[PDB]
Homo-oligomer: A and B are copies of this chain.
Amino acid sequence: PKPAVELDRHIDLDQAHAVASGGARIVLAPPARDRCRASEARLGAVIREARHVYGLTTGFGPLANRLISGENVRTLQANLVHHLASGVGPVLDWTTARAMVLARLVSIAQGASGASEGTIARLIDLLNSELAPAVPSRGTVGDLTPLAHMVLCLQGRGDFLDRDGTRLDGAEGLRRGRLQPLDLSHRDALALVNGTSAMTGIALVNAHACRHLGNWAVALTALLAECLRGRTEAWAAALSDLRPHPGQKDAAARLRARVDGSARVVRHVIAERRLDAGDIGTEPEAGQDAYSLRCAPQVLGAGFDTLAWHDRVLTIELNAVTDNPVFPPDGSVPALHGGNFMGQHVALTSDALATAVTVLAGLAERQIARLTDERLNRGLPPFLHRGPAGLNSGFMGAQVTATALLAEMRATGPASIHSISTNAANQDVVSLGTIAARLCREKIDRWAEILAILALCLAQAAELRCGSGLDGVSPAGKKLVQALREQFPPLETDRPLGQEIAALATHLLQQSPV
């Protein structure tokens, strides 16, 4: 009975992704419909009164100094969509493109965009369908270009994408999705080509993916402890209280929960032990684990606090009106002209999250490096191989692949610092927020692949250490390994792992270990 998200004023990130991913239908609440009808009328009055407004009585960009007569507005807005459709590059994926449509709709729902009922209906119809507009990913400096392409698609003059990414031409899309062609006769084109919808859509998908990968990062760190006799005192709540960062407190708590019931971890607090004369000397192992285990709360915690900041800012952006111009619902003035379309907030938060993702991917990569090293994995086979050593190398190749993926992630930095004056110097500063969000997404995809490798390594390591029965392994750990084994067989002998790594990565981005 497909769930339904009723949009009034505010929608959270989970609800937004539910709609964007097609897991939920979207309906406009009565008060939203009324606010929008009132705004539609205000746009009508602005046109009727011949108010000096950008896009209604003026050209675009530096050409806004050219005033336009009412009889040429249809042509004015038609060419607006035309000159902006200069995008190139691979199309945004199905979910992301739909997230963009949703972002524009949420802004419009605030009742300050002047969008007609039909226009709103076209956006709602798309979201309730199984399709997404096919829009090029590159072209914007932060999001008129991708939105212009969206408009063309909705008019049947651009391709559509099905859940699998297969492309349909304009006519087929409108047909298969039972959609009506977009009509901009009300001169409300600026309600569709405006704001930060693309970067916001991309970022909300990033937020969802990071939540799941963060759960896997925690789950795998915990399982790693069960495979290497990790010490749980480093994850004690007392330490969190002494350094009260919310993300760290949460990370530690989640780690403790994962290993609850485990007989494979070391829970003894070393300071409890009293030493005598015969103890002085060299012990087989130090009283503390390497940082990839001991400092997991602190590293994961910092990443989680970054994601929390990213989500706070993104939630405001998603539910805001980033349009220009805007028509004040209070009727104070006919319209306001400013720069709420400047996507600097998503640009900076996306860049910050990208750095955090790279840091956490580094943690996972080092956890793989330690687990597969016979000199560091406390008795486990080199590279967790099965069968005769040498004749079999196990995950030796996959371990290097994880390193290669991480190295590539590091080569790309923040997008925000590259602003270049453009548009005849009119846009002398630009956010590049769309690019920032896209670069962050690529890093998230690499992180998923690294975590997938770590997951496959841990499933094997758990069985090598505790037997196929996973004796002593926590209930959470057992459930995770058993769940993986349902689709990924043990590595009893070397075999190509590339397709399995890719398949598992796709899963990690959409579901958590529960």
Q: Is A163 an interface residue (CB 8 A)?
A: no
Contact A62/B382 with A85-B496, A139-B404, A321-B243 known, Cβ cut-off 8 Å: yes
Contact A51/B322 with A69-B280, A233-B338, A397-B145 known, Cβ cut-off 8 Å: no
Contact A413/B411 with A233-B336, A276-B50 known, Cβ cut-off 8 Å: yes
Tally chain A residues at the interface, Cβ within 8 Å: 189
Q: Is A325 an interface residue (CB 8 A)?
A: yes
Q: Is A197 an interface residue (CB 8 A)?
A: no
User: When chains A and B are docked, how far (Å) is the Cα of A69 from the Cα of B390?
Assistant: 11
Q: Is A473 an interface residue (CB 8 A)?
A: no
User: When chains A and B are docked, how far (Å) is the Cα of A166 from the Cα of B423?
Assistant: 39
The segment out of A209-217, A349-357, A475-483 that lies at the interface is A349-357
Q: Is A393 an interface residue (CB 8 A)?
A: yes
Contact A427/B340 with A51-B273, A67-B390, A403-B422 known, Cβ cut-off 8 Å: no
Q: Is A487 an interface residue (CB 8 A)?
A: no
How many whole Å from A439's CB to the nearest CB in chain B? Answer: 6
User: When chains A and B are docked, how far (Å) is the Cα of A51 from the Cα of B304?
Assistant: 35
User: When chains A and B are docked, how far (Å) is the Cα of A272 from the Cα of B53?
Assistant: 9
Q: Is A366 an interface residue (CB 8 A)?
A: yes
Which of B80, B140, B298, B328 has a CB less than 8 Å from the CB of A238? B328
Contact A86/B498 with A67-B281, A389-B66, A396-B423 known, Cβ cut-off 8 Å: yes
B355 touches A416 (CB 8 A): yes
Which of B85, B347, B397, B426 has a CB less than 8 Å from the CB of A85? B397
Q: Is A110 an interface residue (CB 8 A)?
A: yes
- A103-132 interface bits toward B, Cβ cutoff 8 Å, 1 = contact, 0 = none: 000000010100000000000000000000
B400 touches A145 (CB 8 A): yes
A245 touches B345 (CB 8 A): yes
Which of B326, B366, B393 has a CB less than 8 Å from the CB of A429? B366
> Which residues does chain B contribute within 8 Å of A46, judged by CB atoms?
271
- A375-399 interface bits toward B, Cβ cutoff 8 Å, 1 = contact, 0 = none: 1100000110000111111111111
Q: Is A412 an interface residue (CB 8 A)?
A: yes
Q: Is A313 an interface residue (CB 8 A)?
A: yes
> Which residues does chain B contribute within 8 Å of A141, judged by CB atoms?
400, 403-404, 407
Q: Is A15 an interface residue (CB 8 A)?
A: no
> Which residues does chain B contribute within 8 Å of A72, judged by CB atoms?
388, 391
Q: Is A29 an interface residue (CB 8 A)?
A: no
A344 touches B298 (CB 8 A): yes
A238 touches B50 (CB 8 A): no
User: When chains A and B are docked, how far (Å) is the Cα of A488 from the Cα of B124?
Assistant: 37
Greatest chain B CB density within 10 A among A347, A420, A439 is at: A420
6 A–B contact pairs at CB < 8 A? A59-B393, A63-B389, A83-B393, A271-B325, A351-B355, A413-B413
User: When chains A and B are docked, how far (Å) is the Cα of A382 from the Cα of B61?
Assistant: 11
User: When chains A and B are docked, how far (Å) is the Cα of A313 from the Cα of B244?
Assistant: 10
Which of B49, B110, B337 has a CB less than 8 Å from the CB of A287? B337
B423 touches A400 (CB 8 A): yes
Q: Is A425 an interface residue (CB 8 A)?
A: yes
> Which residues does chain B contribute within 8 Å of A351, judged by CB atoms?
352, 355
The segment out of A17-25, A33-41, A289-297, A463-471 that lies at the interface is A289-297
> Which residues does chain B contribute within 8 Å of A502, judged by CB atoms?
88
Contact A139/B344 with A62-B382, A299-B429 known, Cβ cut-off 8 Å: no
> Which residues does chain B contribute within 8 Å of A395, judged by CB atoms?
83
User: When chains A and B are docked, how far (Å) is the Cα of A438 from the Cα of B406?
Assistant: 15
A295 touches B245 (CB 8 A): no
User: When chains A and B are docked, how far (Å) is the Cα of A61 from the Cα of B140?
Assistant: 33
Q: Is A99 an interface residue (CB 8 A)?
A: no
User: When chains A and B are docked, how far (Å) is the Cα of A413 from the Cα of B354?
Assistant: 12
How many whole Å from A499's CB to the nearest CB in chain B? Answer: 9
Greatest chain B CB density within 10 A among A59, A68, A152 is at: A59
